[model samples]
Target: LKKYRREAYHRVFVNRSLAMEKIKCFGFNMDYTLAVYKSPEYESLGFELTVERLVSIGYPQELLSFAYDSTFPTRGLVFDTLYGNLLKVDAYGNLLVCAHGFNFIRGPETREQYPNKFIQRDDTERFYILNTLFNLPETYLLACLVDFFTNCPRYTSCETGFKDGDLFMSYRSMFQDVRDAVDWVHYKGSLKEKTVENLEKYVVKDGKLPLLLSRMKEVGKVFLATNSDYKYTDKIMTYLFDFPHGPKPGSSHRPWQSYFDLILVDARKPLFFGEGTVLRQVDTKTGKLKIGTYTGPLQHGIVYSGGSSDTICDLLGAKGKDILYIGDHIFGDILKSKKRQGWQTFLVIPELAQELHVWTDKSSLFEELQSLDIFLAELYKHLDSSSNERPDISSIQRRIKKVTHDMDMCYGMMGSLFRSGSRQTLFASQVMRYADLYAASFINLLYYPFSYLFRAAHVLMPHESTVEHTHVMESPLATRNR
Candidate 1:
C-alpha cells in the first residue's frame, strides 16, 4: 500500500509545497476537473458540430467534407491570425516550430515574418493560442481551411485572406466564425444534451473520484464551484456517482449534494477572482437561481450562482492559501485566482498521463540527443579564432535532429503537450508558476492520507548540478586542504 501511494505521489507534480492540514476549503470546477470527457469521441462530436455551423454560414462548402483528424493537433499551439501560421513557442516566446497551415515552414522561410524567430506575446489580437482541449478541433480546422483555400483553383491566396474573384475572405473572419461555431455547439447546440443522454460515452466513470472527495470532506470542507448551470452540473455529477457503491465497497450510494458543503454554478471565473456580480441562490428543481442576496445557512440541497472569490472566502470562513481551488482552466482557475486572491491552485491536466508515458518510452531518443549536444560542446570547448581546427559537426547535428523528431512524433503531429525541444513551452512555464500541484486527475489524491504534505523536489540549474557533482567528486583530503 505504501509503495502504491508513493507511485501515485510521483505521478502528481508539486510546483510548490502544500500542507493539506492547513487547508480549510477545497473547491472544484465541474467541466474538466470533475467531469472527465472521453477524448476522440467528444472531440469528434465537437468538430462535426462546428463544421456544420461553418457551412450554415457563408464558409466554403468544401469545409463540410473535411473530417476531424485526432492525430493532427496537440494542445498548447498558437494560431497566428496575421500570417495564418501555427506556432509552437518556448517559455520566453521564442518560436520552436512554425507551420503555415498544413505545410511545415522551414527555419529560413519562417524568418520572412519572424526575423529572430520570436514573437511579442503581448500582441494578443494578432496571435490566439489554442491551449484548451476544447480548442483541438478548431486548431485542426484552421489548418485545414488554410490548406483548402491555398490549393483551390477558384480562390487566390492573399496576405491575410483568400481572394474569391471579387470577394475577399480573411483568416481572421474565418477564425471568428470557427470560434462562434464552437461556442454555438456548446451553448446553442446539443453537445451538453447529447452528453447528458449518454454519459458513459462522453464522461469517464471513476470510483476513485468519490473516494477522493469523501476523504477530502473528512479533513476539510469540500465545495463545487463551476461555470456550468445546475441542470448540466446535476446530470454530470449524478453520472459520476452512478456506481452501485459509495467511496468504498459494500457501502450504499449517497446523494451527490451530501458531499459538498457549498454548491455554486455559472461561476464566470477569472472574473469571479476579481470584481464579480450579485450572489443568488439556485432553485435546484427549476435549474435557475433566485434573485437578490442569498443569506442562508450552509445547508444541503442549496446551490449558488455568480459569486466572487471573496464571497466564497467569507462564506466558507476561509481566505488566501487556506482554500485550495482545483480546476482545469489555466488562466481562469489557476493563474488568475492565485495571482489575484493568493489561493493555492491545483491544476487538472488530463494530458499529463499520456505525456509522461511518451517521455518514459522515448527517453532513449532524448538521451542520444543529449549525448550529441555534449559531444558538440566538447569539440568546441578548446576551439576559438586562435585554434586552427573547425570540427565537422554536420553529422552530429543531423543525428540530433532525427532523434528529436522521433521523440516529438510520439505525442502527435504538433509534438509534446509540455514542450517542443530542449526548452519548456509557455504552457509548461505557466503550470509551474501558477499551479501549486498538478496531476492527470484530481482522483489521484485518493492515494494519500488527507494530512499528506506534498513537497516539491528541488529544481537544480545546469551549472548548479555540475558544480555540485564536482564538490562530491573531491576527496576528503582535498576538501580539507581547500
Candidate 2:
C-alpha cells in the first residue's frame, strides 16, 4: 500500500498507456472526489464545532456529551427512531435524498420512545429518505442536527439552533440547508482549517495512498476540482502528495499537479457541467483567469467557472463515451451526465471503502445472525409439529430462549456498530446503493461487473430500466371496452 501513490487522483492524469486507451478523456468533480478528505479529522472537529454552536444557541450543555469519533465506519445504520430525519450526502457533500420513520423505526423492537405513535413507515414515506448525513466530510456537524431533530421538541428546541415546526418544511429542505452549509465550510477548506486548529492536523488526512495510486494507473486524465480556493488546495496537496515521507518504489514523486490535466477551483455546479460556458485559463504564476480555447496539448494549470462538451470535444477531439467522469456527487456528476450528456461516471464514496473493511471484519457476526434466523425458522417448524403431535416444551423451549437471547445480544452489538447518533456510523442502504456497485450509487453503470460481483447468487443490480413500467403497445381500453 505504501508503494502505491494516487498522484493522478487530482488534475486527472494516468501513468499507463493501457488504462488511457480504455477511455478517451476524463472529467472529474472536485471536493470528495479528486481531493479526497481525511474524514475523521475533519468530522470530529466539525462535530465539536457543531456542539459548540449548538451550546451557543442555548442547547443544554449537558446534552452535548456525545463523543465525536472520526474513526467510525459509516454503514448499515438504521435510525429505527429517526429515519427521515437524516440527510443522504454525496462525495461532493451534496444532499441527494432523505428518509422518514420516527415511530416505525425499529417499532417492533423499541416502543417506549413512541408510546402513542400512530404513524409508521408504510404510512409516512416522508419519514424515510437518503440523507446528507454520510456525505458531509465533517459528518459530526450533522450529528448535532440529528441529535436536535430526533431528541428535542420544536418549542424547546427553538433556542437550540432550530425553529419550532421547521420539520414541516420537508426532509429535502433540511438536507438542502445542510448541503449548502457543509459545502460552504468543508468544501471551501474553512472547516478543515478550523478543525486542524481546534482538533489536530490529523484532519488533513493520510493513508490509503495505494488505492489512489492504483486507480491513478487504471485511469487517465485526473484533475483536482475543488470548491476550495487554490491556496488551500495547494497546501493540502503538498501535505499529502509531496510530504517528506517520500515516494513509492516505481512511482514518481515530483508533485501531484504534475499528473493533473487541470485544476478547476471555485466550481459552481449544477452550473459547472450543466451550463454551456467558456473555460477560463488560469495563469499558474500570477493566479489569474482568462478565457481561452486550446489548439494542442493544453497547459496543465487552468481554472474555470464553467466548461462545455463542445469546447472539450474540440479541445480533445473525442466524443462523450470516450470520456469518463468520476465524481462524488450523484446528481451533478453521474445522474446528470449519464441521463443528459452520456459521460461514463465513477462515484467516490469514502464511506464504502470503510464499509467494505468493516463488513469483511463483521462477516462472521452477520453470518451468525443469519444462522440464528435459520434456527428460528426450524424452531417454529418444530413448534408446529409438536403442538399437533405430542408436545414437549421443556427442552425445545429452553433451546429457543437461549437462541433468542444470543440473537438479541448479537443485534445489540451490530446496532451499536451502526447507530443513528454515533459519530462514526451511517445509514446502510446508501452504502449498498451509491457505494460499491450494489446499492444505488453505480449499480446502473456497473450492472455487468455487479452481476459478476453477485454472480453466485444469480442477482442483478438495479438499472434505470428496471424501475420503469413498460409501455403497452395495444391499448388496454380495447379489452375493457370489448
Candidate 3:
C-alpha cells in the first residue's frame, strides 16, 4: 500500500528525501523541538524581563509598561538597524511591510529610505533578523523601544538614532542594548528562574514525547543537544515526561535520560559542526561540570557539554549521512549543521501549523487571486492590438489588492512568516534550500514507518502548471490516434 493522504499539518516538504532504514540515530535540539513552550506566555516572560532589564539601565520608566503581542510579531522579521524600522521582506529582499515606530510605512513612504524597494539582506551592518522562537517577544519589544524614543517629547529623532538631554543613542546601539539585556535576562538569572519555577505555565507538557523516544530507542539511537545548561534542561525535560500516561493519572518512574543514548548541553553548534569544541562531562548530583576533559567511553545517562558534532558522530560510529539532526534555528541548527557535509537535516518550523491552517481555509481567496492574474494576462493582449474593445482591468487590479490585503489581514501585522503574497520569505526560501525535511513538529514523523522511504511530491512549476497535464505527457500513439 502506498503512503498518501497525510493531513496538511502533519505533511512535510521531504526535500531530496531519504530512507529511514539508513538512519543510525535521530538527534534533536531541545529548545523549540522537545520542550514546546506555551505561546504568548513564554514570549511575555521574555518581553517583561527584557523590559525590566532596559529600565534598570537608566532608560525611560515607561519602558516597563510596554506590552507583549504574540499576534503582531512573526518569525524571520528583519530589523533595520540604520533607520529604526521593523521590516517584512521576501526572499529577494523586496520590502513587503515596513514599520517606523508602530506606524506602517506604506508603498510610497517606503521609497524615502528604500529607494529601490529592496536592500542587501545579509548586510548585518544595516539589517538583523529577529528570527527564533526565543526572539518572538523581543521582536515586539524592539518595535516598542523604537516607538518610545520616536514619540518621546524630550528626545529628538535623528536619521540614525535619538537625541536626549545629554546623550545621543543610535538605533544600532539601542538594538545592542536590547540584545545584551535579553542575554542578561537569560544567562544571568531572571528568565530561567521564572521558567524553572513556573514549568506548568511556561512549558507545554507532552506524554507523547516519552512514547516517541521509547520507540526510537528500540530501533535507533536517540539524543538531545541544547545550548541550555544541565540543571535547566533537567527541570524542563523532567516536567515534559511528568504527564499522565493512562486514565489513572499515572506517575512516571523513569528518568528523562532513560530514553536517549546521548545527552549533550551547551553545544556551541555551527562551531560544533565546524573545527569543533572541547568535550566536558557534567556531574548529575550537583549539576556541575567536573574539572579536566572527559576521556573515552561515552554512554547513556551521562550528560556531556560543549562537545563537537564529530565527537558524537565518532562515538555512535555513524557517518554524517546516517544521522538526522532536527531543530528550529535556521542558522545555528539547520544552516550550520548543513555545513557538516550535512548529517541530514529536519528543520522544525512550528509556525507552519498556523500557516497551513490559514492556507487551507483561505484557499478560495487564493484561487480568486490566481484567476485575477490570468484575467489581467488576457487583458494585456488588447494593449498589443489596435482593438477598440479594451478590457477594464483597472477594477480587477483593485479587487486583487483587496483580496491580497484580506489574506494578509488574517495573518496580522507581520503577515505569513514563510511568505508574502505568492513569493516565499527569506526564511522559507532558505528552508527549501537547506533542510532535508521540514514540518510543524518532528513528532509528525512518527506517523511515517521506521522503514519508510520519504518521497517528494510534484508541485507544478511556471507555465507547466498553466498547460493541460495530458498535453505535456501525451504518448506518441495517442498523438497519432488523434
Candidate 4:
C-alpha cells in the first residue's frame, strides 16, 4: 500500500498526506474510471452507435447524421430538457446564456434563470446532453439504450411534438435507472458474458497494479463497489487483473486481491448506502454461490447482492468516510454515492482529460495571436498619448494639426486591421472555451489551471464598455440618468 500513489486527480496532495488507516477501500468503475481509452475513438464509436440506435427506434434516417451539430460545441451547454436547447457559460459554471436547440435564444427569462449561464444538464434535456457525455461500457450499456429511447420515443419523434424541454423528467429517470441496472448487472451472468467477448472493453479489476507499476510508493488499497452483479464481476476481473497482452518479462500471475480490502459487487448503491441489504457469499473455487451475513474479509472471486456499505461495514468493519467509490457517470457514481452514502467519490471524465491535451497544442497559436493584439493595443495607446499632449488647434497654436494628421492615418490602418483580426482572435477564444474540456481529438482539450484553461476568459471585451461611451443609445432623455 505504501509503494504507489492513489490516482485521484482532485486533492492528490491531501490523499498523499493521509495514511492508509484513514482510507479503507479505493473503488473504481471499470470503464473510464480505471481503464483509459483513446477517447475520441471510444466516444466516436458511441456517437455512431447512438445514431444507429436512434435510427433503429424510428428516428428519421437523416436525423442520425444530424444528431450532433458539431457547430456550437458542448462545454457549458444546458439542455432545458422540457425545451431542448444548448448554452454557453463562464468558468464559474454560471449560465452565460442559452441556445434553443440549434438557435441561440437571448432574453430576460433565460438570463435571470441562468445567471452564470452554466448548469449541469439537469432535465429531460439530459437525454441529449448526458447520453452524449460518455460511451457506456457493456455493463452499463442499458443506460445508453435508455438514452436512445428518450432521444427517439417509440412510434414518435422528439423533433416536433417534443418541445426543447419535453420528456426531461422521463428521460432523466431512465438515465438513472439504467445506470443502476447496468452497475448491478456486474453480478449477473449476462454482463460477464459480454465482457469476455470484448463486447465490454473498458473494465478493470486491479486498480492498484498500475500505480504499483508506476512505483508511486504511496498508492493505497483499490476496491470495487459497483452496481454490477458478482458473476459478471468475476468475469470482467479475469480480463482486467489477469489478462496480460503486453510484452512483459514474465508470465502475469493474477495480482493479489488482498491489495483490495473490500470488493462490493452488485451492491445497490444509493440504496446500498441508504438501506442495508442481505449479503451473499460465493465460492471462489467453483464459482458457486451461497447466502450469509458476511463478517469477514471479502473472499476471492465472490459476488454480493442488495447489500449496502452499512452492511459492508458490518462485514468488512470500516467507517463510511474511509471508503472511496469511483465511477464514470456523475450522479450514479459521484452524487448519489456521496450524498446517500458517506463514501468518497471520484468522477471519471475520459473525454475531458483527452480534450485537455488537444487544447494545450492549440493554445500556443492562440497565445501568439493574443500577444500580437496586446502589442498593437500598446502602440495605439502611444498614439493616443501623443495626441492628448498637443494643444487644441488654433491657427496660433497649430502644433495640434500635425499631431492629428499623423495619429489619424496610423489609427485608420491599425484600427481596421486590428479590429478585423481582433474579431477572428475573439472567435478563437470562444472556440477554446466553447469546446470546454473536449475536442474532436484527445489531444485537443487537456485540462489546465482554471486561470489558463479556456480562452473564453480571453475572448473579446465588449466592443465598448459603458464607461467608454462608444455609440450613445438614442434615449428619451440622454442627459438624465433615468
Candidate that would win on lDDT: 1
- Residue 271 of model 2 has an lDDT of 58
Write the residue-wise lDDT of candidate 1 on 1-482 in tens digits.
44333663346678999987789889998888999889888888888888888888777788889888888888888888887888999888899888877899889988988999999888888899888888888888889889998999999998788888999888888788888888988887378888889888889888888988887888889999887777888889998888888888899999888889888888887677776777788767666565544446423445889888788778778877688889887874443434445678899998888888887777788788879989999999997889989899999988988888888888888888888876889889878877899999887776666677888878778877767555336697868956
**What digit string (tens of lDDT, one per residue) describes model 4 on residues 1-482?**
57443232321211112233455455555544444444334444444554455455554565444333222243323334333343333333344434443334556667555555446543344423322244233212322343344455443334322323434233344334434443344333333454456634534344344434222113444556766665555665555555453213453454434445556666665566666567677555555456673455644443455666667655555566665455554343333344434654433434344333433545554565556456545555646544755432354224333433333233221111111221322222333322222222221112222122122222336753324655445575875865
TM-score preference between candidates 1 and 4, better one: 1
The total number of steric clashes, by the backbone 3 Å criterion, in model 1 comes to 0
lDDT-best of 2 and 4: 2
Error of 1 at 32 (Å): 1.1
Q: Report every candidate's CA lDDT.
A: 0.83, 0.45, 0.82, 0.42
Best by the TM-score measure? 1
TM-score of each: 0.91, 0.58, 0.90, 0.52
Ranking by lDDT: 1, 3, 2, 4
* Model 4, runs deviating above 4 Å: 1-24, 44-57, 61-77, 88-196, 199-221, 243-252, 255-259, 284-291, 294-302, 329-341, 369-482
Specify the poorest-scoring 10-residue window by lDDT in model 3. 292-301
Global CA lDDT of candidate 3, please? 0.82
Specify the poorest-scoring 10-residue window by lDDT in model 1. Answer: 332-341
Instruction: Give RMSD to native, each candidate.
Output: 4.2, 10.6, 4.6, 13.7
> In angstroms, how far off is 416's CA in candidate 3?
0.2
